[PDB]
């Protein structure tokens, strides 16, 4: 059974993209809303082709190959992975997921009949990762470290901007909390620094420091 | 029998939360009518990621963690809590809820394949109250004990402003009515003072005070 | 099986009550259509909380109290009351309406499996009439007997102003038509008075007088 | 059982009326679409109040009284009329239809319980008649006889204009076909006259002459 | 068990027929998908009045009358026609269909209370073909035997224009294909002539001729 | 119980095919979603008549002929064919597909109660692939090997033009990637050629080359 899409969502998506571009929050928001449920290679290909021009679509496909092979390596790391099902004649492979699987080419009905959903979930997540990667590459803007809380910007939206910027750069996972917190301390508006340095030095994640500064933040 | 959310609903929710605001009611009403059915961790996580930016999402992870800690303490300290099933040998921990042990990690299919309705509704409730706290922390409520009814205003919009503000306090759940009424009597203009005092003092609820002072107010 | 209210309904209702204003019949007909089917205390109360400001919300709560008070007093006074409970321990009571008694709070399923349909219809009736009362007392109808036809406003716009004024006041049914007639024959400009008092027949209904002036209307 | 309306229809109606006015074709079109099915006095009153300003609403009510009493006289003319049902304790009366019937005031549920539909159909038809009457009176334009097929207007739309104009004037039923046809012959563009005078003089209705001139009409 | 039409459908139909046009397909497709269920005279009459102006409505009454005459002749001359029921004593006449005898006059309720499905579907079919004829008569179809493929055009839009036009003729239902093909071969530009002639003459259907001449045409 | 197609679906589809143009993937995904469930000959044929011009309609009819011809020939050649009929007189045939045989014309109910679901799936498959073929042959894809990078167009827009060109031609799957690569290394402007031929690694996929130029892209 295949559960396709509806032209309402796709059309509103195309219109929002055409009027804003992939650097929009609402763009990626509608994309994430459309791509939460388990999907199929056919639908995700067609959707990305709806929202992306030709050459960025090719770049999308390259990124998708990279992420998909990462997930393939993960599947190799363990049989009990959801990508390596309890039938051994179903070992996952770079061709299996990508969609050119046997008896399914250009015929998503077979992709609905003989695929296993957890694979599709991994596909979807890797797809969104690659899509943010394409948003980065095709449309760059400012690097992360060089961001400052403006002479008038409210703090929490500055925090949103900064976290979204940092996590979407070449840094690895482990370097996503303390780097952000130190950027807070040594770049944000001075009063907020004096606020932060007072914090008990046993606090870890950025969100905890955000909660910290939110209480003590004034109402102007 | 698992089922995700038809992206129409998450889409509309994201639209209204990006537009209107987080403290106004319709936000909460939609969220509740959405977050009532038995859910799962992966169900609410990506939902929060979609309807919230990065930094309030970090706050949300924080508050959800605290509430899950409360639920786990309550469940383990009382095996009579719904968070457990037919057997005591299957206690419920934080990992079982935060999606950390096997049969669960990044496996929405497995998360459908495992937990019992008790833990499900528990997690949903935790998420809901977490969202309320993220609302209150994430945006200011005016200085309630300061607003002074301005001349060119009507008493009614002043009263609505004041109830809105006073609700946004640490104040206990019940003891709002006396605070509100006394702020009415002692916080208004000259004329409203002298038209509330001289009443037959059987008016001891806010709505009635509004009824009075408006019913005897200028019509032009 | 308690079916709640579709959030889209409530949200569009809020948009209407917002822009289109309370005292416009769009709102009246819509709210009637939303509270037409059988309805339940918790749902409709939270509804009115959603679609209104908090102070008019408390105003509505008080009006609902008074209306349901007449209803429960009528149920007391009459055995064959429209919404009585013939069971030998199944009579009605006020706290079995406002959602207060055992198993009413938080669990509308109890509000369904404890209450009788006649009770729900009484609740909905009182709620609707209460909302209308809040509408009347929430917007100050202009003073009617102060209108005097302008030196350069069209006759028909004057008529609309004055009739919308008259129908919206304390005046009982009988106090509509004749008051309108006489305000027309007197409050009007002399020229239009010169006409309508050049009586060639009995002008004994507002619409008829408007028809006369319209037939005799030189455009100005 | 009462089947109310939906805010979509009513709101689109109000918007179309506000942007065009009752002299619009689309206005009356949407009104006729909304008012085809059996209705009730409550809904028709509220709807006309939605689309009509105050004083034209009163004039609407006067016209409705006239048409309703015509239908009452018709009901008197025969018992087997659908307005005089097969229960004699249900003889129709000017108060019965108009909506101030017993046990139904401001409570359309009773109007749904104890009214008979054919009465409601007669009500609706008389309502639309009165509404066109109000469109006439409040917003007149050109008299009928003085219309000419323009130096460039296509014939069939001129025919629409002329028929709609004539039938909506003081002429009675019988004088609606030959009057129109003779206006065709002695006012329309000359070539079309020469077309018509050639027609066999045994043709009666206007539509037949319209069909006649449509064939022989050129394509330019 | 009678039921009218939910005014949403008539509303949308009126919108599209006022906007698009009467000869283009979607008009006919909607009308058919609307006019297929067993109907009644009053069902289709007001529908035609809503989705058509006055004068084409007169044409419609004309054509509906002619088609009902055909149906009545066919029914009475063959008691084996569905337009009759179990009994011969209940023949079907024009008055029984045009709503003229009792139990029917202006009585949609009675019209539900009387006729049998045969006459119903007969009336619906009559109305449908009447509408087709009103379409063909009410608007021009271009001079099909005249259009000559212009230079700056592509052969394909020319071909679509030509099939559209040729369809709008008195021409018999079947014998269109030869007319179309020969107009192709003898009505086009020089180059298209010399690229249709020199083919291997197994092309004897229109679509194939289009396939050829386009597949061998300029791409720029 | 044959459920037709909702007219609103078809009408919005026509609006899309109208404005958004055939060769845009919005249309492809939509039409797939409209012909995804089991479908029947008469309905889908009339659908394609609705959503297209008549000449491409006949083109589609011919393509449908060829596709269903391969399908019925495969059903002949294989007993265990995907859509065979195991009954001893229940084999398939071409005229039992195009809606020609007894009880197929005008009465789709026969098209349901005579045909097997495998037959319907074959019909729908052939219809969809036929529509895609009409899409290809209906819009002339620009000549690809004629592109040469402009003296002042952005690199990425050039890339989009050329890739959309390449994927849309006669070229089989294998004939996509490498042709793109080499057209990039050669057709491009000298400066971008100067870059991409200063090879510091293997550039063996279009997306990779785009990524290289993008990383090295001075904005122009």
Residue numbers in the entry:
A (entry chain B), B (entry chain A), C (entry chain C), D (entry chain B), E (entry chain A), F (entry chain C): 10 to 229
Question: How did the manuscript describe this experimental structure?
Answer:
As the virus buds from the cell, the viral protease cleaves Gag into several fragments, including the capsid protein (CA) that then assembles into the mature capsid shell (core), rendering the virus particle infectious. The CA portion of all retroviral Gag proteins folds into two separate domains, the N-terminal domain (CANTD) and C-terminal domain (CACTD). In mature lattices, CANTD interactions form only intra-hexamer and intra-pentamer interfaces, while CACTD interactions are also involved in formation of inter-hexamer and inter-pentamer interfaces. Our results show that, like lentiviruses, RSV is sensitive to IP6 in vitro and in cells, where in the mature CA lattice IP6 binds in a pore formed in the center of the CANTD hexamer.
